[PDB]
């Protein structure tokens, strides 16, 4: 199985890494990277890497991408050494602030230069976060795209379409953390641990080598008709904010409990295939999570959008 | 038993509250309060109070005490409602940043105006954090002193005298979090839960009503001579950065396992009394922590320093 590191960069990455650990996501090594020593000390990762100790003295980057970038530059030797040996590196961060925006591209570029298949999974800030955050996030996304093989972008505004109408702001942020965790786990669960219908690493690498950007969609369903319902919810997810038939590559993960059947996996796959372009390169796998009972989760990652 | 709330304000308070929860500190209600939604979502407290949602949009106060203050002002109705009914409120924060420095005094003043015995337990930043942090912390400490009954100040530089010489910066910060937890738990364990030698709430209130400032000291020891060794370490703690004989009031907590003896409690108390002024108002109690084996911890809180 592939050797996989998941790197949480800055506050958005910190929370996503903790959510993966809370969900007992197996087969990956976690590395929390941050300029903010207080936040870093709340990481559940065993490897906690403080960057920019001299520059920022543990105080964070103050929403300044240049300080995030220079912090990662300060610590480039340590970052390179931590990443050495990985076949694949996920770099997770929230865009718009200082450390995510500035450090995540530096870290991703280091991983990519080492030869790791490098996948960024990042949030674009909620519009309510304001103009400075939006502008800085656009800069980070552009930098991230240069530094990775595939960048999966989670449009946080779309979460607001998904959650209940009176959801407090704190809970909207909490859901963004969960979506980042779902983005990484959707891919890693199919390659990091044994399974009946895993994915071939080489095939993941091919779908993750497309240009342009990538998006994700998530569907969850229970009971009768769950496989079809979950798949339909995934392809119609507000998160997948382009028509899936525009994608060059599609990866589908269906996860269920021990009762997940061949018939259900096929049903879900057929829905996603049918919605996608006729000439799409689509790959899929299934995961048994024995902690699930009657729910199934379908995650779709679509790459190579114009 | 007294009804006690422990309020973690901003990043330093967040980490201290999590450390209390990790150490299974009983008998108190925890409330995490923050302008930073990502950090707040890592709180282990069941009550998570986002303040300044409109002003800061979940992004934190950017090391600006005025923004911390105005965030608390925005949310004053919610803060007042959360604090109603408490006999005692601990307000814990790191001084020097925006939310701790600015919001903690507002919150403490609300608690004090409600009639709660209000005790602040705050860190003064490490010198390495720089001049802006030092100056802002001095302002916060002055504000905090006006807003509480007793302010216990933890001089972070003194932690550097305590930890091993090559301790990384991240671990020095982690130890500050632990000291804040020890400051609160030293007092709360003697009044919040049943015990053989608890303290009288009225007596705690008297020692906590002194003017001037307060300091703490911690000593830990195992094996033969543990009670005397721990007590001596507490009174000579670099954290207690004034001669204990200068204090008007002294509170001592000795905590040990089920083997903690009357003789040991007395031995420790005698050491602290002997070191203190002849006319000191000193009170003490003991706690059995059945999770301890042969270690004992002595905590001393000294109040009313000139
Ligand atoms: K698997
Ligand atoms: K007790």
Curated annotation (Swiss-Prot), chains A, B:
During sporulation, is negatively regulated by MciZ, which binds to FtsZ and inhibits its polymerization and the formation of the Z ring. One of its GO terms (molecular function) is GTP binding. It is found in: Cytoplasm. The keyword Amino-acid biosynthesis does not apply. GO terms for cellular component: cell division site; cell septum; cytoplasm. GTP binds at residues 11-15, 98-100, 129, 133, 177. Changing residue 270 to R: Disrupts interaction with MciZ. Homodimer. Polymerizes to form a dynamic ring structure in a strictly GTP-dependent manner. Interacts directly with several other division proteins. Interacts with FtsA. Interacts with Phi29 DNA replication protein 1. Interacts with the cell division inhibitor MciZ. Essential cell division protein that forms a contractile ring structure (Z ring) at the future cell division site. The regulation of the ring assembly controls the timing and the location of cell division. One of the functions of the FtsZ ring is to recruit other cell division proteins to the septum to produce a new cell wall between the dividing cells. Binds GTP and shows GTPase activity. This is Cell division protein FtsZ. It comes from Bacillus subtilis (strain 168). The gene is ftsZ. The chain holds residues 11 to 316 of 382 of the full protein.
């Amino acid at each position: 199985l592939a050797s996989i590191k998941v790197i949480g960069v800055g506050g958005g990455g910190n929370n996503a890494v903790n959510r993966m650990i809370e969900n007992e996501v197996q087969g990956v090594e976690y590395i929390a990277v941050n300029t903010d020593a207080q936040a870093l000390n709340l990481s559940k990762a065993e490897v906690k890497m403080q960057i920019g100790a001299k520059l920022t003295r543990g105080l964070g980057a103050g929403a300044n991408p240049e300080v995030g970038k220079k912090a990662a530059e300060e610590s480039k030797e340590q970052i390179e050494e931590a990443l050495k040996g990985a076949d694949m590196v996920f770099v997770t961060a929230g865009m718009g602030g200082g450390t995510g925006t500035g450090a995540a591209p530096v870290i991703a570029q280091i991983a990519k230069d080492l030869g790791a298949l490098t996948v960024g999974v990042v949030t674009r800030p909620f519009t309510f976060e304001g103009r400075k955050r939006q502008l800085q996030a656009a800069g980070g996304i552009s930098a991230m795209k240069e530094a990775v093989d595939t960048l999966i972008v989670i449009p946080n505004d779309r979460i607001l379409e998904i959650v209940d109408k009176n959801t407090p702001m704190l809970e909207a942020f909490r859901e963004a953390d969960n979506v980042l965790r779902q983005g990484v786990q959707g891919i890693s669960d199919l390659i990091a641990t044994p399974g009946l219908i895993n994915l071939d690493f080489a095939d993941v690498k091919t779908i993750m080598s497309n240009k342009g950007s990538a998006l994700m969609g998530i569907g969850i369903a229970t009971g009768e008709n769950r496989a079809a319902e979950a798949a339909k919810k995934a392809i119609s997810s507000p998160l997948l904010e382009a028509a899936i038939d525009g994608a060059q590559g599609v990866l589908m993960n269906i996860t269920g409990g021990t009762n997940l059947s061949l018939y259900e996996v096929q049903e879900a796959a057929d829905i996603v295939a049918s919605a996608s372009d006729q000439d799409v390169n689509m790959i899929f796998g299934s995961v048994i999570n024995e902690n699930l009972k009657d729910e199934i989760v379908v995650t779709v990652i679509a790459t190579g959008f114009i």
